[PDB]
Amino acid sequence: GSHMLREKSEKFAFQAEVNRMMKLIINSLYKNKEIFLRELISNASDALDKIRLISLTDENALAGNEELTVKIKCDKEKNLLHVTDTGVGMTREELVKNLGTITSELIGQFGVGFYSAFLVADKVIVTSKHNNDTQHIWESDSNEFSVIADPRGNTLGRGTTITLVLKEEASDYLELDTIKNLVKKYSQFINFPIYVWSSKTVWDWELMN
Numbered sequence: 001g002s003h004m005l006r007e008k009s010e011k012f013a014f015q016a017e018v019n020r021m022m023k024l025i026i027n028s029l030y031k032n033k034e035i036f037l038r039e040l041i042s043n044a045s046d047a048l049d050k051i052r053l054i055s056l057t058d059e060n061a062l063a064g065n066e067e068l069t070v071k072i073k074c075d076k077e078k079n080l081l082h083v084t085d086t087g088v089g090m091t092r093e094e095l096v097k098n099l100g101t102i103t104s105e106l107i108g109q110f111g112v113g114f115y116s117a118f119l120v121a122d123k124v125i126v127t128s129k130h131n132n133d134t135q136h137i138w139e140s141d142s143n144e145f146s147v148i149a150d151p152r153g154n155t156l157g158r159g160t161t162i163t164l165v166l167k168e169e170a171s172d173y174l175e176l177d178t179i180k181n182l183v184k185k186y187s188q189f190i191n192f193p194i195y196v197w198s199s200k201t202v203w204d205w206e207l208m209n
């Protein structure tokens, strides 16, 4: 089973238009970086709408995970921010196509906000499980991207986790108070329940909307 690593078939280049779009998004939102969270939450909401629709006509749609939620975790020690939804997920092919091929209001309207994650992160990782495929991991530092089968197996059930390796200067997004304030603000009109893993010292999910 060494064919894939030896041939490097897990490696991909972004489409030129995507490189151009990433630069446009990043340069224009430089003074309003916090918008990245609003966009990841919006994308999660869209994914939840999709599986909700599919569940109307597909009786086994929610079998891999019965809930419809967005859950956010701050891992200060590991310098990571996780945004996990139990939406429709993406197959390995969708990770390649949907993320690798193709002003705050416009960005949100055309739904290309995913790329704004690079305003606060040196690396963006997307772990996803779709009913029609096994769990896969997409990763990128914006200069290329790779997609590999998740060696951890099916841990998500169904859904997607966006993991951000935050830039040194973006450490404030690991602060619970900062994240609750933003998540509360950006989840206000989202129809699905959004939670933030927080302490009260005991930890548990805190409903934000």
Ligand SMILES: CCCNC(=O)[C@H]1O[C@@H](n2cnc3c(N)ncnc32)[C@H](O)[C@@H]1O
Pocket (backbone or CB within 6 Å): 043, 044, 047, 085, 087, 088, 089, 090, 098, 099, 101, 102, 111, 112, 113, 114, 115, 160
């Ligand atoms: C061109 C901008 C980048 N592409 C996306 O955000 C697309 O990738 C997929 N996507 C992004 N976040 C997602 C999520 N949390 N669940 C499912 N699909 C997602 C959707 O098809 C989006 O339209």
Ligand SMILES: [Mg+2]
Pocket (backbone or CB within 6 Å): 172, 178
């Ligand atoms: Mg502060």
